[PDB]
Amino acid sequence: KRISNCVADYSVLYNFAPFFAFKCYGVSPTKLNDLCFTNVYADSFVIRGN
Amino acid sequence: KRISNCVADYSVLYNFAPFFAFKCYGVSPTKLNDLCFTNVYADSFVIRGN
Numbered sequence: 549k550r551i552s553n554c555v556a557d558y559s560v561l562y563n564f565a566p567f568f569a570f571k572c573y574g575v576s577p578t579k580l581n582d583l584c585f586t587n588v589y590a591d592s593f594v595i596r597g598n
Numbered sequence: 599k600r601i602s603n604c605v606a607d608y609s610v611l612y613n614f615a616p617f618f619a620f621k622c623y624g625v626s627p628t629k630l631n632d633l634c635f636t637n638v639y640a641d642s643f644v645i646r647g648n
């Protein structure tokens with residue numbers, strides 16, 4: 549899913565799904581609200597736990 | 599809760615609550631029985647998992 553030309557409030561993401569915590573690389577989930585991005589890509593799938 | 603003037607045996611903490619593991623900063627849970635502290639503060643609350 550392509551995400552652009554919008555204001556992203558990542559703090560509300562916790563309300564959408566009951567995930568325990570983020571796993572971010574090269575960035576912190578704490579600072580996501582303070583940054584800008586050219587484009588955002590949301591890749592969704594289902595796998596096994598392991 | 600203020601904790602002072604007592605001998606603390608942290609190894610028994612695992613019996614009190616069914617928590618999986620500690621999360622310590624600046625110290626290891628392994629060495630807690632070998633140290634002294636001027637005062638201990640226990641802050642209790644309830645939050646969401648995320």
Ligand SMILES: *[C@@H]1O[C@H](CO)[C@@H](O)[C@H](O)[C@H]1NC(C)=O
Nearest residue numbers: 560561562563564565566567
């Ligand atoms: C997902 O959408 C449904 C209706 O399609 C809504 O009832 C539900 O609250 C939504 N989930 C969350 C976590 O808000």
Ligand SMILES: *[C@@H]1O[C@H](CO)[C@@H](O)[C@H](O)[C@H]1NC(C)=O
Nearest residue numbers: 610611612613614615616617
């Ligand atoms: C907590 O206290 C109750 C009685 O108040 C006791 O039965 C129980 O064993 C205690 N919990 C633990 C983990 O020892």
